[PDB]
Scaffold this motif. Structure first.
Motif, short mmCIF file in Angstrom:
data_model
loop_
_atom_site.label_atom_id
_atom_site.label_comp_id
_atom_site.label_asym_id
_atom_site.label_seq_id
_atom_site.Cartn_x
_atom_site.Cartn_y
_atom_site.Cartn_z
N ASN A 139 0.82 -1.22 0.24
CA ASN A 139 -0.09 0.03 -0.12
C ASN A 139 0.91 1.39 0.17
O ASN A 139 1.89 1.33 0.57
CB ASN A 139 -0.90 -0.04 1.22
N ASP B 221 -1.64 6.71 0.39
CA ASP B 221 -2.95 6.74 0.20
C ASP B 221 -3.85 5.54 0.81
O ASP B 221 -4.99 5.71 0.64
CB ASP B 221 -3.49 7.39 -1.13
N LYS C 176 -4.18 2.76 -0.61
CA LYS C 176 -4.49 1.80 -1.61
C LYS C 176 -3.41 0.96 -1.95
O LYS C 176 -2.38 1.40 -2.13
CB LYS C 176 -4.85 2.64 -2.72
N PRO D 11 -4.64 -4.06 -8.01
CA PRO D 11 -5.54 -4.95 -7.60
C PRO D 11 -5.13 -6.24 -7.21
O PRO D 11 -4.28 -6.71 -7.98
CB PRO D 11 -6.42 -5.13 -8.91
N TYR E 207 -0.09 -8.76 -6.73
CA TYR E 207 -0.72 -7.53 -7.03
C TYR E 207 -0.36 -7.15 -8.43
O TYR E 207 0.86 -6.82 -8.64
CB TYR E 207 -0.56 -6.48 -6.13
#
Ligand SMILES: OC[C@@H]1[C@@H](O)[C@H](O)[C@@H](O)c2nnnn21
Ligand SMILES: OC[C@@H]1[C@@H](O)[C@H](O)[C@@H](O)c2nnnn21
Ligand SMILES: OC[C@@H]1[C@@H](O)[C@H](O)[C@@H](O)c2nnnn21
Ligand SMILES: OC[C@@H]1[C@@H](O)[C@H](O)[C@@H](O)c2nnnn21
Lengths: 490, 490
Positions: free
Chosen positions: B352, B355, B357, B361, B369
């Protein structure tokens, strides 16, 4: 030798841009033992070790600016300079270096009269607190910046700065705590060519009983702690909305020797050890990673409180820029071992690139090669990596060689077109740098005056103004000064 | 998920570009004790420490490709694959791991038959000599790649390579000496999640009597010495104009966590310790400077002769790319010491960003990821920093989780649209990279077959072809495989 349309004009720059000249106290003042002044490290070094000065000389007289300061101001005014960078002699103000030892009122009056005279002539004082002249009393008590306790020198320097702020702070709006921490530490305690002349056993200096891998980092650490203490004091009790504090770094541009990525890495390690060593602590509160990884335990760690005081401890920054070098990789291996602190960069610094040509034309002395592109490189690093702070080029110039074996006729000394060309090219580089977004705000010619050039003695003349030592240090403007006058007053 | 005009087409790439799929011997072959095959490190580890495999499994059967290789080739041919990347089992060829112990004729015959079948079907073999399966006899004799002599393992590996060149070299034109030296050394001897399961005292592995700060570098050094010797042998006695040798590196992309130059420095150190550790030795003859500066005495030095054999010891290089991380700075400090070899980079690797995130994905398993931009970044580094050599993406794929607690229904496993989207996006990235000047020449989907996924056992399916182990290891093409067939043969 720039064509007429390439010569810089004053209107190329903003109206509030600053042009000045620069000196330092030991280099110009003389009066080394007059009106209560205590002995300094440099008085002691020159007097006991004349063999370590190239011409055997000292700065007992210098340019006699203690007695002749009024004519210095007249020169500045005649040239239309916006400002004057000079330094204060710590031992002239505090002959024993300490609060206990007392303030010397004649020391204070000298700088007070100089400052007021500059201001009544419309010239802004940019004042360097420390330009290498440590009171010998402190050198004998605890070795000055070698202070292994990281306490006494910090307190003694901080009090000195306080005395300057109390006595001159109402008139002075521009302070620089230290000049060239890198050169001072490396040359005084690494190669030992500066006072007090210390280096590792086996090396050629006056006192080969120090440690060239440790002592430079000890002194550097003490300098940064002192700087942070003095700025903390200044911000809390002395700064107003239009005053500024910082310090000035010596810096050679670095260009990779070859096309290999290894030389790029070498170049980066070289910027770090030269500039980053002192810049990164004041920007972010610690030394560069590269130095930590390579010098390791020989580089002291900061307390968290000290990092906080260090980070952001400047409103402006000085750059003393003269030349550049090619940086060439050296691998870590059992066949290489650092001897000098500067060897921790694992990079040789070369005048000549792989073609065998010098990085730029030689300016006459052992180390200055003209490479204005390096100034631009440096200002772009300051812009893009280090937050684009207000920058002054607090020194820039060349030294004309003048020796007993090869005298420089006064006529040739005055016709200093080589210096003039160099100054013109670097000023034009500053305009190019502003166009690229550099937050550079001024330029100071190194040496209003021919002066005592440290271990070179009087063998090098850096003045835009000639000083006749055979007369009574009478001053004559050189061609470089005459152009700067024309430039400023058009 | 890509729109019609965004889906890659075969004519996006040159006519001589290579599309393929990849496996490894321990993961697919089975027949672990058949036809003279010797025990390997992974046989030994799974049998003696089922508790260190997530589902307690082993690859005694795998995908049964020792007996079923003919249908493996039929599947490749149906999909229009240009190439197949597979590995040779050292202990299947040399059951005691040495010349003394003798060549196993049934082992030779197996790979001979696979290679001949591939070629008469127009499929080019890309052969990995070592994909982590060390003969257990060498593990017991001198620790395999832990060999502190830096001699025995080098001679035994070089002899293994000689047997491969002697018996297959007339038909094989593409050789990879080693697969994932970084993963292999770090996981086998750092975290100890791979056979033989060694790590420092105090850490959670099967044998916490090693040294996670040292053993990985010892093993890595032996891998590099073995590579250099095998390539030297190949160049002298076996290489032809149209044949090529290299190795394959695991590499995650690295992106600076924040905007700070410190995270740019951390990012560079991360590329260095992941990719540079083994790449830089084969490019220039030594480890990255950052690694020498940080690991110091824990990273062995090469003899000059060894450096010369290493430098330029490839005609092509494989990159096994799956994902990327944000690299965030860690300062050198008295309150931090590395525990694992990978901590020597002084950078935390974050999924991450600031932010909160993820970098891209999640693809389902613990570590993948989706960030195809990272592949482009990697290919630009290879292009601009490391000479733009011929590159094959020798692995790219995702692992579908399938467990006793949460079974994956066969229908959902075959409708692998998540895998297909991932494969499509990375092939699209290769097109973009080629136009940007990358010397990339091919792409291999990791996992022709669902197989034994090391410490995860069978809990992850990476195949474009499904393997039903409850039946008789019957193969069914997934949607990914069906699209690849369309892509290749359109
Ligand atoms: O005094 C000697 C001068 C110093 O003033 C400069 O800081 C330094 O960069 C340099 N290099 N070689 N000689 N020097
Ligand atoms: O060497 C010439 C000048 C010295 O005279 C100054 O005192 C010093 O601050 C500096 N740094 N770089 N070069 N210099
Ligand atoms: O099992 C965990 C997987 C290994 O099996 C891969 O081979 C390896 O390159 C990787 N790196 N990050 N996580 N892993
Ligand atoms: O973990 C997934 C795959 C493993 O199955 C392969 O054996 C290995 O070479 C690799 N490296 N990177 N990722 N992987």
């Amino acid at each position: 030798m720039l064509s007429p349309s390439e010569i810089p004009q004053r209107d190329w720059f903003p109206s509030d841009f600053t042009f000045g000249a620069a000196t330092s106290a030991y280099q110009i003042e003389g009066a080394w033992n007059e009106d209560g002044k205590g002995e300094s490290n440099w008085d002691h070094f020159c007097h006991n070790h004349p063999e370590r000065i190239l011409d055997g000389s000292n700065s007992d007289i210098g340019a006699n600016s203690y007695h002749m300061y009024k004519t210095d101001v007249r020169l500045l005014k005649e040239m239309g300079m916006d400002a004057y960078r000079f330094s204060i002699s710590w031992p002239r103000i505090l002959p024993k270096g300490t609060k206990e030892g007392g303030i010397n009122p004649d020391g204070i009056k000298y700088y007070r009269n100089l400052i007021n005279l500059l201001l009544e002539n419309g010239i802004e004082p940019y004042v360097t607190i420390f330009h290498w002249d440590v009171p010998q009393a402190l050198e004998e008590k605890y070795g000055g910046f070698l202070d292994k306790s990281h306490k006494s020198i910090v307190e003694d320097y901080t009090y000195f700065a306080k005395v300057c702020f109390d006595n001159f702070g109402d008139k002075v709006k521009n302070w620089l705590t230290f000049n060239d921490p890198q050169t001072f530490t490396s040359f005084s305690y690494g190669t030992g060519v500066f006072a007090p002349g210390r280096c590792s056993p086996g090396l050629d200096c006056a006192y080969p009983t120090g440690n060239s891998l440790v002592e430079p980092y000890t002194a550097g650490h003490n300098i940064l702690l002192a700087h942070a203490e003095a700025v903390d004091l200044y911000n809390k009790h002395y700064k107003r909305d239009d005053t500024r504090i910082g310090l000035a770094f010596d810096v050679m541009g670095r260009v990779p020797y070859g096309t290999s990525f290894l030389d790029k890495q070498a170049e980066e390690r070289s910027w770090d050890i030269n500039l980053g060593w002192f810049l990164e602590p004041v920007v972010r509160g610690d030394y560069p990673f590269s130095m930590r990884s390579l010098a390791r335990e020989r580089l002291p760690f900061f307390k968290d409180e000290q990092k906080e005081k260090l980070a952001g401890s400047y409103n402006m920054l000085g750059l003393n820029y003269y030349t550049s070098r090619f940086s060439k990789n050296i691998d870590i291996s059992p066949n290489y071992s650092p001897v000098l602190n500067t060897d921790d960069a694992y990079a040789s610094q070369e005048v000549n690139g792989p073609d065998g040509k010098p990085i730029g034309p030689p300016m006459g002395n052992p180390w200055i090669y003209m490479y204005p592109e390096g100034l631009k490189d440096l200002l772009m690093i300051m812009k893009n990596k280090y937050g684009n702070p207000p920058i002054y080029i607090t020194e820039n110039g060349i030294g004309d060689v003048d020796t007993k074996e090869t005298p420089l006729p006064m006529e040739a000394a005055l016709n200093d077109y080589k210096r003039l060309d160099y100054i013109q090219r670097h000023i034009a580089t500053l305009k190019e740098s502003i166009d690229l977004g550099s937050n550079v705000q001024g330029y100071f010619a190194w040496s209003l005056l021919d002066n005592f050039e440290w271990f070179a003695g009087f063998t090098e003349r850096y003045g835009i103004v000639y000083v006749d030592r055979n007369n009574n240090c009478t001053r004559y403007m050189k061609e470089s000064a005459k152009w700067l006058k024309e430039f400023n007053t058009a």
